[model samples]
Target: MKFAEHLSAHITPEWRKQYIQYEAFKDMLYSAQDQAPSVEVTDEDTVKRYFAKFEEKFFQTCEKELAKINTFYSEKLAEAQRRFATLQNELQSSLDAQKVQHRNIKDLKLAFSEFYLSLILLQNYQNLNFTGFRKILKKHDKILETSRGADWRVAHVEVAPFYTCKKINQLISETEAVVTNELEDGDRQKAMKRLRVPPLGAAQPAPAWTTFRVGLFCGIFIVLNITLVLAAVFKLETDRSIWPLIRIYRGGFLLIEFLFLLGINTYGWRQAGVNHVLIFELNPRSNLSHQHLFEIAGFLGILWCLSLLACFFAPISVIPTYVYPLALYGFMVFFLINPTKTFYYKSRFWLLKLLFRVFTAPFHKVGFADFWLADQLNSLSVILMDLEYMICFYSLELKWDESKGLLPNNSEESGICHKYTYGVRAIVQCIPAWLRFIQCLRRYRDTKRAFPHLVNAGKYSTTFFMVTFAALYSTHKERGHSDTMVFFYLWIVFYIISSCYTLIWDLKMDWGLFDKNAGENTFLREEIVYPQKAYYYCAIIEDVILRFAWTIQISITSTTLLPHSGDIIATVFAPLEVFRRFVWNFFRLENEHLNNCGEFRAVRDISVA
Candidate 1:
């Protein structure tokens, strides 16, 4: 392969500006070589051409690049050295105190691993760019019929700071030793295994057998869903008492389907050269391919569909039908927290840990995954509210007797269940927004950047009032035939206001679209990762429509302006948000990838008319 293509593929996406500009340097050589002085010029008298201008330009450009490489290398090396120093101090303090903690060991291992990886990347940076300079010089020599490359190489190349530092090499050796002695308990084999960087793939290669398993599970998934719909059609009497709890399973089925679609999004992301694994900090070496994502989704889907379908056997089973959803959740929880080293333990743990971070958002710093998952939760509000209702129903009125009505007869006692859920529903739906809200505040506290953080926080703050007014609307309607016209009208306005607020934010801030300088592609920014402009327009259109998709339900409602329960029918709304988010993923990620390119032709820091 050409060095340019290899460099284009392999250069660190975020650090493109720091790499040697091999292509530009090559083209510069061509321009310089093209000058009349080098191409058998005619007049020795009037042609005072000396190739002096080319010498001045080439040498100045080369010096600038060499300086750039040296500066970056020095800063990075200093950062690594400080980290190594701090780590050794930590180790020494622990050793002297002799209070070896598990947190220290676990954190220490991960810290060292990350440090080593950083070192390796820096090392690779040095090697690739140095090779870039070497090849670039050789290209110049070959093109110019001059031996200036070796002369320049002896003077400038070997003496460059990045090559001469030798400190990074020492740090790598010391870090290797520290890992073995401290983290790996003096075991070289274990340390070596830990240190080895595995070959990175977008996903693992799937054998044919795995394909058959995925297809079978998906086939079963579809068959069971159709069967459930048929049961709904066949006029099978659903004991109304248990139906609310049973209907919650629909969200789970939708979630699994959403996940299956995530595989497709990942496929699109990979196709468009988006580094999703890197952006999400996923396990790139063993990341889930689209196939594995589908298999997992389909596998869980079949099991979930079975649980819901099992509830249809209510008339026959000895076990109460309402118990099935709880049982399914229990088994899945156990699987997630399974102690054995099997069933993708690390992947499950990554999620569990990230979820835990959301609850503890104030205490820990927010990251891309933290905020992104919180955004995901916003779309799952319906399921979450349903989950709250399910928990409320099962916990309060769980009856061993099949005939015991879930909504008990006493009015006040029964109010304790569904009424209790309404209050919790406010909080449950508000959780993601609230989580995101506090994190924005936390970011303000950390970064001291008030505008974006405060405005972003303000976006979520509006959610509190929207849910509050909806709750009020529900309570007033439940009280009597009388309508709370104030809150009802207020909610309609708030919904519109908030939807437009978010739509604008998504297009401008997160998505990085609707640019003032979108010269060629209409409103999109100068750089978009997706080749087709149509995708951006489609995404923009879908986002605007789905942001107010809840209004569609209102349009369908006999009441015209209001649905009897906004939170309850979110099942319909949440699924469309699912599609909206999937559409949003491509562009938002595209924006981020383009931003990672510096805010390549393997050289990012240049622009021209």
Candidate 2:
């Protein structure tokens, strides 16, 4: 393989701007070759001009690249030193006070692990750029048939700080010393192992074996879905309506499919060089890859399909199959908090922490993960409403009525007490929107910015109003109230306004598009990561269409536009929402990746305990 390809493979994504300009230099050498004088016409005056122009242009780029490397190296080196002092003193001061907290050590370990990664990145930076410099110069010599490459290497290349600095080596040794003596109880092997930073490609990759597993499970899942459909058509000839237990399985299906497309989005991000690991602040050493995510989705998806198979095929046995899905969901929750170190527990704990932050919003400082998941929950609000019904049907002690077909128990003697349900349903539907709203307000109070944060809050506030007025309108229409027109009109007004508000925010703020100076990019940003302009165009249309995609749910699910339309509309809308979210996920990280690169924020700004 060419050194350019190998260098491209090993070069860090976030630090590429500072890398040696090997490709540019090599291209310039080729251009010089194309411009070389013919054998007979070559003369001293023109001969020197071609070489002179190419040499100045080539080395000038290298000079600029060296300046960039030196600037970044010094800034990051000082940051590492400051971080070391802060960490070492934090430990020493705690020891001086005779108070060594157990949890803080883990945090310190994470901090230092990340620190070690940054250190290794710096070392690799120096080595790779130097090698790249040597390779470029050699290519220049080979192509131009000149010995000036080696002549210039000794004078200009070796003296650069990126090639000659010893501070990184010193820091690496010093850190290992402290980690061994203080952190690892004087065991150098253990300390080195703990401080190890896996190189690029250490994480899992999409293997063909994982592909077969996902296909295996998904194939079985699809066949089962068909089997259920066949049973509804032929086997269950009379009992057209299964219990609500079977109908409420939308939540599980949506959750599994959400992960599947999430992996696809992750793949697109990686393929397009989005640097999602750093943007999401994932641990580079252990974050799951796209294929890993797909494997997990299929693994869990098959579990869900099998449980519902039982729930559908055996509804009235002595044990009854209705409890299968309930138990499945219970075990799902159990797997998250099972106190065992398995099943990607660190990422699991990370998910739990993120959700906890979302649930307890506006108290904690709003982060990207916090609000990102909150918006995800926004898309899954259908499932949240289903969740409320899942609880009510189970908790309210309701049973299927054979005579009335689908009505809840209405007899007073059955002690069925249904009252004040309007608020609960509204609250359940509005929970995610409300969480995002308070989060926006917190950003406002914290940052004292009124333009965007408060503006975004007002967007969510429009959603709150829409849900509230819609629920009231539904209840009033059900009760035959003459004042229902007010609520209905209010809902329609907020619906249109919020959809427009959200669509604009998506195109303008979240996506950073519709630029007036996009030049060749048209309506997209000045710079885009992915190669295709059509992907951006298609995604904008999808967002605009799906921004108002909830119309089906409001129109069909509640109003009973068709028989069992609730399940039919929900099943269709859930996946569409998930699809929209996956599309949003691609460009969202693409934009954030651009933002981070614009600022050259390679490492996170982690605060010490």
Candidate 3:
């Protein structure tokens, strides 16, 4: 041992480096020995042989591990998570983003509240003193007498004016004065200053578009529009009987309603972010809110369908009764589930205000409301609470009874869409289902016991199935006749109870089961599932693929919707239909790419083009 130590000490620097390498090799061999659960080394000869084989494997494993480490680190460096942080961090970020959005919404809403209030204040200033209107004008240049017309109906578009005085007093009443004694220097000083100044100039008007549309006719139009849409939606059950003569003008009615909306409001779907707000020079500048116009179109179409139902079943009366309840229930779900068509949060705020004014008008002064108004301001707290629920529940999975029905995923044909053809809509609809299937398969195959909540996708599937069945059943004519009362009542009761229970239960399950499981499942597995800020990317990929398939299906099926005709369906169906013929048939079908990667090959060709 002393001789070996002396030799090691005597080596030159270069030689020492070589010596260190040799020692590493030796240590590696020892490490291999140390790790063995059971190693068979009968004698010296066997030991030498074993070590030789071990050296080869050990080096290979080291190289492989190093390569893996390199790949992993590179991926990690580019990961959205590393860019953002943990999964919790990502979720937190999304929530924070939403909070900022909601806050901006709140600000916009506050501004809108101020506009309406200011309008009322201006009107009342005349009653208070002759100079009140000018006082309002001087105080609220951004709002008063600008573009908004004399009355709310005259306001037409949803642009701003000023908030009412009642609203201002309400805001003041709600605000706490910096408990002067409880004040810490800076914040309290700021508060004292804030309290001392009148809020008149301080008031920011609702987004430029809000105040223009907030009076009796404006309010009436909204209420009427919603009611008409709802009624039209209900009438879809029968063939267009109630409006029989108007049936031929189906497209015209659509155009008329939409154009009326545009003409009256001077606002369009642009408010919803459809037509893309800032796509300068490319598309006409429309409000962002146009996204839901498609939804409105669909709603109208459904209404037409309901009218048809009324024609077919209303006389029988039984089906209409049942269908009405289901339809209405479905509408409620749609309403709650439907993303609001408005861009600004104040759209809702203004709407609530309109409702308040409508109900309270007879009791209060028509032109201006009472000066005292804090409870109304506190209504915002309620709005926020409702908003939280809406945010949490939108697109949430509702696993209905396990054995009750076959659950359909949210992916399905809508009132205006059918699933038989692979249209663009169909493709879009299939994505959620395909995703659910993929997630379920991935979970099952990986033997992952965590995130068991995904297992309830079957429940969502089941609920959807039952609801659809119930809807269909309601449309049938079995029990029938006098007034459509029994059918309606039964359906309404069933739908409300079932839907509410499902929503509440889903919330409970999400809290109790998914919250913890999901947290843990993604803790380590995030790089596998949500590897990046790629939710939008994944959705895009799915959309593109599905859209392509839909187009092909339309072309091949020659469906009425597409107005194309083809024997192409026969060609598409030939391979399956011609099972009896083997040799010759097999050669042609195989050549035609029936059993081959037809869809993928087509996609590739399209991509190349």
Candidate 4:
């Protein structure tokens, strides 16, 4: 027990224990050093002294960045306020009243919010660089891009060394156009003006070409459904039951159905608004000799040409009843298959994982499994019921059954098969919807946790509509009501209404887009209660919207006038859904949310000190 031994035996352990407690803080400081000095501590004395120097250097670095960030954002905020006032003044000059004044104030608040966020981030984080701050600023820009206002312009303003203003003239001009064009109906400029604001019972009119195309699609859909109805009603008594005659009608129906599907697919492609396709013709295994490759490509081209020629003539020659479903199924497979590691794969993988988590949930949490499994059962019951009706009808061979009535099943065998296939098809489609309902509930509860109130009330409301419709559908079937026309019609109407409302609400909640009220009246309140927490909830809302799209696929397929067209069109245009989901979630907002929280907490601690 000499003096050195005494120090090691008793005091050393205590010093080490205290040093371990500050390990995280030291690592945090070390991480913040991009080009700053680094401190390497080998012992307790060095560790203690290192922190003292660390805090001093950290605060100095933060204060330096803070001055620059503050200057940049403060100017932007003032510019935003000035523009808002100018816009409101113009509205007042035009004799617009309280609505206009309120609207202007609301938008001004939203636009200024990002600058406030930047201030908080800078004031809270001791080591956040300009680049890092700009990254976070850009994120707010992304969220508010669709919002009405020049909030996006905030990210572009600079005040370091020299100050420069950008987009101010553009903003003023746009505001003037909105005020001047107030009387214009469905003006494109109006929609653009309210990019961050709510619509005022106005829609941006489609172009003439789009209007014409959409009108044509409506006519085509009406004709198809009416003809289907007529075919069921007339049921012409054919004394000459010749195979050749039936074959002629079969060929005609097949050709008509194919054309209808083609039209639907073309319309969907236009609606998707994609202008190009990626060609991978030369990417894979291009090392073959130029001559060899040319020969191989030429042979495949000839083969493909022959197949196309066969398809061109197949409507008349081929039995369409057999060919159409098979062809459509091939198309479904093509769309479902992943050609690359694409968004579809991620969505599909996410769904698969969700199911796995439910099924493989720990035995201790059997209640969790039971809850999800019960939801799956409800969907399964509806699927089974539809399937039973389809099987029973086909099994009865009602086409030939002479129990003649005013309305008969004059539908061809192919039509019956098509309907039956869709019955099963819809079942497959529905699994995602039930999963989405569960997800929406979870999101609602999470939103409650994040916000002061039920910020996800709109989301859960849409879910309620969905579930209500589905339960009605089931009940309609249970009462042995054979006529599906009422529910089928109601299905499409509610779907359109629910979808539009859900989309509008989602945009409003997530980005403050389409908000009818001002900052004082909105859920965001005067202050962002928890910038990071609010963002977390918004991210989930975005994800839920994507899930909503997936859920509606089932409804469209089940209740459309023509299920085949609906199903085929969705598959043919699968790329659009994949691309949209990719962009929406690609920001990875949650990571930034967490980063800002950490940065804010660290800076706050220093400020308190």
How do the predictions measure up, each by TM-score? 0.72, 0.85, 0.20, 0.28
Question: What would the TM-score be for candidate 4 when compared with the true structure?
Answer: 0.28
Candidate 3: misplaced stretches above 4 Å?
A: 1-205, 213-217, 220-240, 243-453, 464-504, 510-609
| Candidate 3 lDDT, 17-124, residue by residue in tens | 112232343455557566554345456676566655764564454344334433432332234223222322433454466544555433332332222332232233
What's the alpha carbon RMSD for model 4? 27.7
lDDT of 1 by residue, 328-383 (tens): 77776787888888887787888889999987898888877888888877876667
Flag the better candidate by lDDT, 1 or 2. Answer: 2
Better of 3 and 4 by TM-score: 4
lDDT of each: 0.74, 0.77, 0.32, 0.38
lDDT of 4 at 502: 53
Candidates sorted on TM-score, descending = 2, 1, 4, 3
| lDDT order of candidates, top first | 2, 1, 4, 3
